[PDB]
Design a protein around this ligand. Structure first.
Ligand code: AGS
Ligand code: AGS
Ligand code: AGS
Ligand code: ADP
Ligand code: MG
Ligand code: MG
Ligand code: MG
Lengths: 335, 339, 315, 258, 327
């Protein structure tokens, strides 16, 4: 499991040695530490490295944390309920758990909270609205001797320039396939898995695209199908939704009509109803449609253009299927 | 007293450690500080409106001016500083600002008049005036027009358009220029020598080149490079590559993208984009670097340049809406590869 | 002199050219009696206050003075007033015909506080056999559901072109005014289902120029120059439309919002061009309106809208 | 047959307007039909419901088809309507006048003489919204359970990663056929790891004894991960039969550990 | 002393003969007051047209020098609610004057910020007390006033100041001050005013301050353009010329140095180039269509942020590709 085997310190990290050394350098003198922003691909291990850095700045009790609740009152009598992850040395807030009320929680909670300082971990800073980021802009500078921010995000694109300047930027590159394979080797020798040939582990990396969280989860999911004994041709158990998307692309390239558009809409509804975001659906659908060797460059260019257009539409809209079906119809018209 | 302040400055980041304390520390904004120094001997300081890019030194300039005017004793008694972290509605502007303006100037001490000019007026500064609503701004009109004998108003903003036209007409407009390599290389070299920052020949000028008219970001990048070079302890000099690595920019990876765009089909470009998106880079920075390279390089046709400019504009406009960076970057590279 | 809205204010339910169904309902109620508690909601200037006034007058005859209690938003209508004065009026003894009841007219009921509205429930429930309540508001949602549960709900709608045209023709016949078809059309167009605003604009145009013509109406009540907007959109060359927009609309002080909105109306109601080109022009006009609503309203946006409309018309 | 008084005072059921938007009369001018339909859409004030009706009906309507582009042009309008509808909550409702134009694009594009039969309709969106709410509430409860037990897991789990990556694998692990495993020691070790995973996610095995006289009270997982993960109706039946035998073995092991 | 007030306040008209630009409404109001029939007035118009000055001079002509006591002047700065109406306005309308005998005047300046309940309560105050008092409502937007309140008053639309009246006021100011103005400078000043006397007075004071001399010289176009701010016409035309004729890299360098030497904004340059190219007599309207569309798209993108360099290159490429069709 991902959680059973996870590093708890900086000396327990097993990839990106230069990043571990940079973190040790940054934690050598912990009091004169500026705000930090960890950015990189999703599933690299930045949330583990931030906790490992806190374990170097403070005692080992940083992992012994508790979940509490705090209530807020907006301009109306709608009560905002937000759970907080707190520790005797730091606290974690995730403003991605609500709508446009991120600014209120951010400003009020950070003002109440504001070695000698208490660390703050802002999870998924990309969901922070521009107004909440503007509110945090001056809170980052006014209280710099009591509150230090460690913002974990996957892309600095939606982060405003003032916030980018107000904190150090630390990039976390995805681990190489070799390091992923070495980690999976230790995991399968500790979990007592049976490997007929080691190269399968490499293939797992080649199916994860640098994601360690996805790699270990897929390894464990396919270890339950092979009954704790992975063979030489164990089927990479691509998440059910990936198989559904692949079948959808097969249906797209096979038949281009309105009767097939109805069943495409039905598949989109069944995918959206099971807690699957539409942006990821569109991304996977487009990327796996470009992989279709039956199409040519003229078709793939139009497909990527329509996918960008409808991605903008979906980012500007709320009825996601209204854009997904339109993109599917435009792709059908292109082919 | 003063020694505690010196130690706190020495244990402070370089942005606040080297904040200009006098009007002479301003390196590039000379046109404004010349007038500010001339009016320091006179007593006809008009209402001022500082505007320009962020990190040009507006707040530092006004702080240094107020210091040189009032001394460290009257610095806390004849100044009303209102930032964006405070409430600045109509009620606040009508009650607090107007009560402070209507009040008389505090009496200077015997030590104040001997060293400082001590003008007969006080200063009310409003930092980040972009967040002020237009009605609360119009409320300040007669407040600053009738009580000008006892108080002077200093507005500070980044976008001069956010301030109403009457207020922009009542105040003298001071535009702070972007701090590029030319007019800030002296300040950057001074900061580097004061901190023993051993770098190469074209590092500092490069840093400001990445800053794009922002001395604060340049000083932060210099501090980060100095920390990264002191942790290693190799005793070598900081390189431009090491600076542009931590600044969010490498040149070789961009040249690889140019080669894949020039020569290559849809499949190779898609594969290289999928590989490049594994290493975390902001798509906005990649688009900006591609734009700089394509527009600056004198090896492409003008017909190609119009199309590359329009495509980069469309890609930036689409990325400014929260779209997926991978899809937009792939679409941009594919569209510019067909050219 | 008295304005035409007040002078020609209807005093009988037949003179109301509003919603025919509710008007005949109230007429039959006044004819038979037994008026129930009612709440009349709608938009300003469609005949809500006049309707309830006419109903109360016709239902009470000469006893209107001592049987009708009028309370507007200009008077205190808090918890204390509902507790003392409304209750004293409802408990007041009055000999009325065996088909009439005391009427409590409450104008602008959407402005009463929650406490007064809550106290009015039992006040109207215990004296529902000798006192009746008629509320006149613009938003029925502002009145609590318990109060709405004890009364009828009459939702008044906008006045169609025919009704306002008929009322204006009646007023012109009663006043001997010189008019023309295009002038009345422009008046009704600028009224937007508002009968009071229509009569006010008519009286203002009469007292300012004497002749009710579209030019005068678009002059004394100048706002966006619709006919001018139509001539701008129907231009054949881009430079002519640009010069029209610059001189007639932009150089005279017409706001961009009025220009684009008047533009939308002209297009929707256009008949010279086909349906598809009209829909494309509305789409361009719609996008321009969206951009302006975001604060990007300038002359360049309207110029680009006209350019896109011409490109659509450019086959 | 009562409808005369309705023609006299009642408008056009939004459903009747949707069926009229797909009909073209060959005997009337297309412009007169368009203005009549515009007035009916405007008088109804419910442009959104009419459009949702048009969106549900258009795939079942007969329309001369060349390459199903007509649907591509209409996705751009529908996207324009969604932007307009979002802006109605942010801005004073001046934009409401353009809402009646989007339904009329269906009359222009898909209106045909072939569409003589009334297509009945339903509200899949309210059911999908209530289902999405229920699934989001289940996921929010699982995320809270992880936050209380797994101190570190909660820092790496986004709501999307939990739905698409973690829950499908967790369910595949619970639904795996333990009857194929001949090695009792390996079966016991896997069952101990699965009991540890059920504990980390706070997944309770409830004996649903809501069975009328039929001697097998089915074991169910609380919260029901099955409703979030199992999109395919064919896989639901296969997984339910396999899970019933696994969950009884897992319950016996949880009781042994208790 | 009046020498301390700004030029906008110092030159405020005190009599109805000093209000230029508005002639059809000024004469009508003078006739209303001389003949006696003064109805409820509604002065609707843009800012800086002279509505407040007009009504102040009118009240001065009506009541004399004691205007500040016989007139009830309420504005947005004062609390104007429904209770404020009920008490103050009704007590003022129902009672009579304490200084003389005659009708009263209630000047509701900037009444477009009043609450709907306040207007609903006032619309019956105007109709009830109409034999001893009058009402004057000043507005910039006629959509914030209820139609009932809008129908009880006679509407007067204050048109923007034309060329003749604004030049007359400029000549009056140049007579009152030891200042000279060039004819072309005066024309450029009238061009950047849009009928707003406040802007003209403010920039006139500012360019007099810019003179740096004892005012023995004249004020030319250069002074106005350098003082009023905004990309000077010189730099504007230089950038346009370098875009239209010079090379891509040279055009980029010119735009960069122009926008960085004076700290100019890209949106101001865009609007200036749009205004300049409007006079260009061009070929087939396709170039104009492309130019307007691309420039409006770039302006809408700038209105939301982004990369200034990318947007500048986009402007250059859009103008170039639009003009490439003219050949
Ligand atoms: N002209 C300058 N000379 C020297 N240092 C400068 C100059 N401009 C900026 N700095 C440095 O940058 C820091 C920030 O200065 P500020 O005055 O806050 O910048 P800014 O113009 O206010 O940007 P804002 O607040 O985002 S609009 C100062 O403390 C200095 O260290
Ligand atoms: N149906 C109608 N027939 C004739 N005149 C009408 C009609 N509706 C309105 N009017 C005129 O408009 C004036 C005012 O009408 P009101 O009933 O006060 O408006 P309203 O519908 O009550 O909307 P309010 O009062 O702003 S909420 C009347 O005095 C008439 O002159
Ligand atoms: N017609 C005019 N003739 C002469 N000076 C004028 C004229 N209009 C405006 N001014 C000048 O502009 C100043 C301001 O005029 P105001 O009447 O306050 O503007 P306004 O028309 O009331 O618009 P507001 O107050 O923004 S709603 C006056 O004091 C004069 O100096
Ligand atoms: N140093 C490390 N050595 C081995 N595995 C690691 C290391 N750091 C993280 N991992 C594991 O790799 C995966 C990374 O995914 P995740 O922890 O979600 O990333 P993040 O910390 O960025 O949220 C997890 O299974 C995590 O426990
Ligand atoms: Mg500042
Ligand atoms: Mg009424
Ligand atoms: Mg005024």
């Amino acid at each position: 499991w991902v959680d059973k085997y996870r590093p708890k310190s900086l000396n327990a990290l097993s990839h990106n040695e230069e990043l571990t050394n940079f973190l040790k350098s940054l934690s050598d003198q912990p009091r004169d530490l500026p705000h930090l922003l960890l950015y990189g691909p999703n599933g690299t291990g930045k949330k583990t490295r931030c906790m490992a850095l806190l374990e170097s700045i403070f005692g080992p009790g940083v992992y012994r944390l508790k979940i509490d609740v705090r209530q807020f009152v907006t301009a109306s009598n709608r009560k905002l309920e937000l759970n907080v992850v707190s520790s005797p040395y730091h606290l974690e807030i995730t403003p991605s758990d609500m709508g446009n009320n991120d600014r209120i929680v951010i400003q009020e909670l950070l003002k109440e909270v504001a070695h000698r300082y208490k660390c703050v971990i802002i999870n998924e800073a990309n969901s922070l609205t521009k107004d909440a980021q503007a509110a945090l802009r001056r809170t980052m500078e006014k209280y710099s001797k009591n509150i230090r921010l460690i913002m974990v995000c996957d892309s600095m694109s939606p982060i405003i320039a003032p916030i980018k300047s107000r904190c150090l930027l630390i990039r976390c590159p995805a681990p190489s396939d070799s390091e992923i394979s070495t980690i999976l080797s230790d995991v399968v020798t500790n979990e007592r898995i049976q490997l007929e040939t080691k190269d399968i582990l490499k293939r797992i990396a080649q199916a994860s695209n640098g994601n360690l969280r996805v790699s270990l989860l897929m390894l464990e999911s396919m270890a339950l199908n092979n009954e704790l004994a992975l063979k030489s041709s164990s089927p990479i158990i691509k998440p059910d939704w990936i198989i559904v998307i692949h079948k959808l692309t097969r249906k797209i390239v096979k038949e281009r009509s309105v009767n097939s558009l109805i069943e495409c809409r039905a598949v989109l509804y069944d995918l959206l109803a099971h807690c699957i975001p539409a942006n990821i659906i569109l991304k996977e659908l487009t990327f796996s449609l470009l992989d279709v060797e039956t199409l040519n460059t003229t078709n793939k260019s139009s497909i990527i253009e329509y996918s960008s257009v409808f991605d903008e539409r979906l980012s500007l809209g709320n009825k996601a299927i209204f854009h997904l079906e339109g993109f599917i119809a435009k792709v059908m018209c292109c082919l | 007293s003063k020694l505690a302040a010196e130690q706190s400055l020495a244990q402070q980041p370089w942005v606040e450690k080297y904040r200009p304390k006098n009007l002479d520390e301003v390196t590039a904004q000379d046109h404004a500080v010349t007038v500010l120094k001339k009016t320091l001997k006179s007593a006809n300081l008009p209402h001022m409106l500082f505007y320009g890019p962020p990190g040009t030194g507006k707040t530092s300039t006004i702080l240094a001016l107020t210091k040189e005017l009032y001394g460290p004793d009257l610095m806390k008694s004849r100044i009303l500083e209102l930032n964006a972290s405070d409430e600045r509605g109509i009620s606040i502007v009508r009650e607090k600002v107007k009560n402070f303006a209507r009040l008389t100037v505090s009496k200077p001490s015997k030590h104040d008049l001997e060293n400082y000019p001590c003008p007969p007026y006080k200063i009310i500064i409003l930092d980040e005036a972009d967040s002020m609503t237009a009605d609360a701004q119009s409320a300040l009109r007669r407040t600053m027009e009738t009580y000008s004998g006892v108080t002077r108003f200093c507005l500070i903003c980044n976008y001069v358009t956010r301030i109403i036209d009457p207020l922009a007409s009542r105040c003298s407009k001071f535009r702070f220029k972007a701090l590029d390599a030319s007019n800030a290389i002296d300040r950057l070299r001074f900061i580097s020598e004061q901190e023993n920052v051993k770098c190469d020949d074209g590092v500092l000028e490069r840093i400001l080149d990445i800053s794009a008219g922002d001395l604060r970001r340049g000083i932060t990048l210099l501090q980060s490079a100095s920390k990264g070079a002191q942790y290693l302890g190799d005793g070598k000099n900081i390189t431009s590559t090491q600076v542009e690595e931590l600044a969010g920019v490498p040149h070789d990876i961009l040249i690889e993208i140019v080669e894949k765009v020039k020569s290559g089909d849809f499949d190779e470009i898609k594969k290289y984009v999928n590989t490049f998106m594994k290493s975390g880079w902001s798509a906005a920075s990649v688009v900006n670097q591609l734009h700089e390279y394509y527009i600056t390089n004198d090896n492409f046709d003008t017909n190609f340049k119009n199309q590359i400019s329009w495509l980069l504009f469309t890609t930036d406009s689409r990325l400014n809406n929260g779209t997926n960076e991978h899809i937009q970057l792939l679409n941009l590279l594919v569209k510019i590869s067909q050219l | 002199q008295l304005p035409w809205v007040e002078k020609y204010r209807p005093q009988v339910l037949s003179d109301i050219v509003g919603n025919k169904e509710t008007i005949d309902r109230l007429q039959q109620i006044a004819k038979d009696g037994n008026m129930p508690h009612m709440i009349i909601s709608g938009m300003p200037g469609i005949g809500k206050t006049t309707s309830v006034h006419c109903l109360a007058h016709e239902l009470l005859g000469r006893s209107y003075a001592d049987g009708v209690l009028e309370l507007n938003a200009s008077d205190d209508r808090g918890i204390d007033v509902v507790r003392n004065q409304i209750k004293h009026f409802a408990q007041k003894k009055l000999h009325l015909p065996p088909g009439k009841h005391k009427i409590v007219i409450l104008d602008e009921a959407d402005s009463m506080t929650a406490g007064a509205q809550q106290a009015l429930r039992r006040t109207m429930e215990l004296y529902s056999n000798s006192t009746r309540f008629a509320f006149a508001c613009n938003q029925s949602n502002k009145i609590i559901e318990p109060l709405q549960s004890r009364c009828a709900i009459l939702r008044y709608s906008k006045l169609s072109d025919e009704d306002v045209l008929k009322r204006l023709l009646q007023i012109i016949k009663l006043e001997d005014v010189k008019y023309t078809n295009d002038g009345l059309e422009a008046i009704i167009f600028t009224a937007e289902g508002d009968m009071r605003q229509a009569i006010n604009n008519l009286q203002s145009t009469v007292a300012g120029h004497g002749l009710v013509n579209a030019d005068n109406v678009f002059k004394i009540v100048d706002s966006p120059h619709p006919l001018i907007v139509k001539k701008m959109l129907l231009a054949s060359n881009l430079e002519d439309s640009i010069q029209i927009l610059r001189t007639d609309l932009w150089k005279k002080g017409y706001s961009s919002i009025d220009i684009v909105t008047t533009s939308f109306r002209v297009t929707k109601n256009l008949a010279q061009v086909k349906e598809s080109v009209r829909l494309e022009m509305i789409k361009e006009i719609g996008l321009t309106h969206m951009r302006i609503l975001e604060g990007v309203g300038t002359y360049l946006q309207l110029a680009s809208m006209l350019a896109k409309i011409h490109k659509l018309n450019n086959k | 047959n009562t409808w005369a008084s309705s023609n006299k005072d009642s408008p056009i059921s939004w459903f009747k307007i949707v069926n009229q938007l797909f009909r073209k009369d060959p005997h009337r001018d297309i412009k007169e039909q368009f203005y009549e339909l515009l007035n009916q859409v405007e008088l109804n004030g419910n442009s959104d419901r009419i459009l949702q009706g048009c969106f549900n009906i258009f795939p079942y309507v007969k329309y001369s088809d060349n390459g199903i582009r007509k649907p591509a042009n209409i996705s751009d309008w529908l996207f324009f309507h969604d932007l307009m509808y979002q802006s109605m909550y942010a801005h004073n409702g001046e934009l409401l006048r353009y809402s009646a134009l989007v339904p009329l694009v269906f009359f222009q594009t898909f209106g045909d003489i072939a569409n003589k039969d009334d297509i009945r309709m339903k509200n899949s969106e309210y059911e999908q919204r209530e289902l999405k709410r229920a699934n989001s509430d289940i996921v929010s409860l699982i995320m809270r359970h992880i936050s209380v037990q797994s101190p570190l897991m909660a820092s790496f789990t986004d709501r999307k990663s939990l739905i698409f990556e973690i829950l499908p694998y967790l369910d595949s692990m619970i639904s795996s056929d333990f009857n194929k495993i001949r090695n009792l020691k390996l079966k016991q070790a896997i069952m101990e790891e699965l009991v540890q995973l059920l504990k980390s996610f706070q997944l309770n095995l409830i004996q649903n004894r809501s069975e009328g006289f039929d001697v097998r009270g089915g074991l169910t997982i609380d919260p029901p991960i099955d409703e979030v993960v199992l999109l395919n109706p064919k896989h639901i039946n296969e997984v339910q039969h396999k899970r019933a035998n696994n969950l009884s073995s897992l319950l016996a092991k949880i009781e042994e550990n208790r | 002393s009046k020498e301390n007030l700004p030029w906008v306040e110092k030159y405020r008209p005190e009599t109805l003969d000093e209000v230029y630009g508005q002639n059809e409404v000024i004469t009508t109001v003078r006739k209303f007051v001389d003949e006696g029939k003064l109805p409820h007035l509604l002065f609707y118009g843009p800012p800086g047209t002279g509505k407040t000055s007009t009504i102040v001079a009118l009240a001065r002509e009506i009541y004399g020098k004691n205007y500040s006591n016989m007139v009830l002047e309420l504005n947005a700065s004062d609390d104007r609610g429904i209770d404020v109406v009920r008490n103050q306005i009704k007590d003022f309308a129902s009672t009579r004057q304490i200084f003389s005998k005659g009708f009263k005047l209630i000047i509701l300046d900037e009444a477009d910020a009043m609450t709907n309940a306040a207007q609903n309560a006032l619309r019956r105050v105007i109709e009830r007390y109409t034999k001893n008092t009058r009402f004057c409502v000043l507005a910039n937007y006629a959509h914030k006033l209820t139609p009932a309140l809008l129908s009880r008053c006679t509407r007067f639309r204050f048109q923007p100041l034309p060329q003749e009246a604004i030049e007359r006021r400029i000549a009056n100011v140049l007579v009152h001050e030891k200042l000279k103005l060039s004819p072309n400078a005066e024309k450029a000043l009238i061009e950047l005013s849009n009928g707003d006397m406040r802007r003209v007075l403010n920039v006139l004071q500012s360019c007099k301050a810019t003179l740096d001399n004892p005012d023995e010289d004249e004020i030319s176009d250069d002074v106005i353009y350098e003082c009023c701010g905004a990309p000077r016409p010189s730099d504007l035309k230089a950038v346009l010329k370098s875009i239209l004729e010079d090379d891509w890299g040279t055009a980029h360098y010119t735009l960069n140095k122009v926008r960085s030497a004076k700290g100019l904004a890209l949106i101001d340059l865009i609007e200036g180039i749009v205004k300049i190219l409007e006079d260009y007599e061009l070929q087939n309207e396709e170039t104009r269509v492309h130019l307007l569309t691309k420039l409006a798209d770039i302006e809408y993108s700038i209105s939301k942020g982004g990369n200034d360099q990318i947007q500048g290159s986009a402007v250059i490429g859009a103008i170039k590709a639009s003009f490439e069709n003219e050949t």
